[PDB]
Amino acid sequence: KPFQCKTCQRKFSRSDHLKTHTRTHTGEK
């Protein structure tokens, strides 16, 4: 169940993983 970040281009194994990660780029809230 591979995931990809559409912000840097890093991969993950879970959707929750991907999310936690991506929110370190903008991490709005």
Residues at the site binding Zn ion, with contacts judged by CB under 5 A: 5, 7-8, 10
Residue number, 12 or 29, with CB nearest to Zn ion: 12
Least CB distance to Zn ion at residue 10 (A) = 5
The 3-state secondary structure of the chain reads CCEECCCCCCEECCHHHHHHHHCCCCCCC
Least CB distance to Zn ion at residue 6 (A) = 8
Least CB distance to Zn ion at residue 7 (A) = 4
Are the beta carbons of 1 and 14 closer than 8 angstroms?
yes
